[PDB]
Amino acid sequence: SMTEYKLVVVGADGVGKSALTIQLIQNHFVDEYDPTIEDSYRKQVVIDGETSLLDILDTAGQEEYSAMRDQYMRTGEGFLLVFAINNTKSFEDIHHYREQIKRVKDSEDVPMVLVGNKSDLPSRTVDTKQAQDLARSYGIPFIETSAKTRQGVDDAFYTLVREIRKHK
Amino acid sequence: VNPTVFFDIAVDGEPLGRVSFELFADKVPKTAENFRALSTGEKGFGYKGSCFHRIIPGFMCQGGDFTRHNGTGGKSIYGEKFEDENFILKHTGPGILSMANAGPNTNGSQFFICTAKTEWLDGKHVVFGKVKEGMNIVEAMERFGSRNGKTSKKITIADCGQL
Ligand SMILES: CCn1c(-c2cc(N3CCN(C4CC4)CC3)cnc2[C@H](C)OC)c2c3cc(ccc31)-c1csc(n1)C[C@H](NC(=O)[C@H]1[C@@H]3COC[C@@H]31)C(=O)N1CCC[C@H](N1)C(=O)OCC(C)(C)C2
Ligand SMILES: Nc1nc2c(ncn2[C@@H]2O[C@H](COP(=O)(O)OP(=O)(O)NP(=O)(O)O)[C@@H](O)[C@H]2O)c(=O)[nH]1
Ligand SMILES: [Mg+2]
C-alpha cells in the first residue's frame, strides 16, 4: 500500500489552517469562520510520480490551550507553519510554534514548511522578503498561498511531503 | 425577578425532555434579556428549531446558531453581535449557562451549558444563567457528543419560551 504521511497544520487563530485544508481535501473555499477544535482528513495524491496518502491534522488556534499541543506534535511527521500575510502578529506567532515543535521532538531537523496565507488580500502587512528570510534561517521552504484562489494550496502540502521524504 | 425560560429538547425528532434556566437579569441584564427574547421568539427569530451543534462529554453542550445551523452563525436582539457585559459570574460547575463568542465583544446568540467546572473560561465568556430544572436532560445529551463536539444525532430545541 501507498506510504502514509502524518501532516499537521498549525498557526494562530484565523490564519486559514482549515480553509487551506478544506480546499485541498474538498476543493471548496470555506468563507465562514468556524474556529477549530480538532479535525482530521485523508487524501491520496501523486507527488513526484509516487502515490501517497496524506493524513492531515487541522489544529486549534486558541492560545489558551497552547500547553496541549505536545501530544499531536509528538505524533506528527511534518508541520505546516501558517501565518496570514495581512496579520503581523500571526507572523510573530510562528516562531513560538516552531520552537514548540523543536522542543517537543527534541530535534533541529523536523520537516516543516512556512506558509504565508491570504495572498489574495490587498491589506498585506508582512513583506514576502521577511517571510523568505525567516524560512531561510529555519532551513525550510516558504510557500505563498491563497485558500480562496487555491494558489499554492497543493504546493504547500506537496512540498511538506517532499520535506518528510528527504528526512525519512 | 430573574426570568425563567425553558427548552423542550428532541433527539432526531423524538422528545427527550425539558430543561429550564434561571437567567441572571439581576447581574447581567442585557445578556439575560437577549437570551430571554430569543427563547420567546418575540422578535420573529430565535432558538426554536435550532440544534446543539457541539457536545463534548465532560465539558459542555453548545447551541444557538439559528441563522446558519452550522455552528458559525447566530445573532443577538441588538445587532449581529454585542459587547461583553461583565465577567462577574464564574463557570463554577455543571449547569452554568454562558455565552459563546469569537473573541472579545462578539456575543451573538450561541450559548453553552457546562457539564463540568470550566474555570479557564472565566473572564472570557459572559456567564448569565444556570439550569434550574432538568439538568439530567443536559446530561442525557452528552451521550450524543464526541471528543471534537460532532454530534451523532440531531439534538434540537423543539420548543422554547418563557415560564
Ligand atoms: C485543545 C483542545 N480543546 C479543548 C480541550 C481542553 C481540555 N482541557 C482544558 C482545561 N484543562 C484544565 C485546566 C486543567 C483540562 C484539559 C481538554 N480537552 C479539550 C478537547 C476536548 O480536546 C480535543 C477545548 C477547546 C476549545 C477550542 C479549541 C480546542 C479546544 C475552541 C475553538 S473555538 C472556541 N474554543 C470557543 C468557542 N467559539 C465558538 O464556537 C465560536 C464560533 C464562531 O463564532 C461563534 C462561535 C466557544 O465560544 N465555546 C463556548 C465555550 C466552550 C468552547 N466553545 C468549546 O467548545 O470548548 C471545548 C473545550 C473541551 C471545553 C475546551
Ligand atoms: N481572503 C481570504 N480569506 C481566507 C483565506 N484563508 C482563510 N480565509 C478566511 O479567514 C477566516 C479564518 O479562516 P479559518 O480557515 O477558519 O482559519 P483557522 O486558522 O482555521 N482558524 P482556527 O485557528 O480558529 O481554527 C475565514 O473567514 C476564512 O474564510 C485566504 O486565503 N483568503
Ligand atoms: Mg481552523
Numbering used by the authors:
A (entry chain A): 0 to 167
B (entry chain D): 2 to 164
What does the paper say about this structure?
RAS family genes encode small GTPase proteins that regulate cell proliferation in response to growth factor stimuli. Although neither RMC-7977 nor CYPA alone exhibited any measurable binding to GMPPNP–KRAS, RMC-7977 makes multiple π–π and hydrophobic contacts with RAS in the switch I (SWI) and SWII region once the tri-complex is formed.
Kd2 values for the most common oncogenic RAS variants were all within threefold of those for wild-type proteins. The ability of tri-complex formation to sterically disrupt effector binding for the various mutants was also measured, revealing a good correlation between the Kd2 measurements and the biochemical EC50 values for RAS–RAF disruption. Similar potencies were observed for inhibition of RALGDS, PI3Kα and SOS1 binding to KRAS(G12C), KRAS(G12V) or KRAS(G12D), as well as SOS1 binding to wild-type KRAS. Consistent with this hypothesis, RMC-7977 showed sustained pERK suppression in KRASG12D PDAC cells in culture for 48 h, suggesting that broad inhibition of RAS family proteins can overcome the adaptive feedback observed with mutant-selective inhibitor treatment.
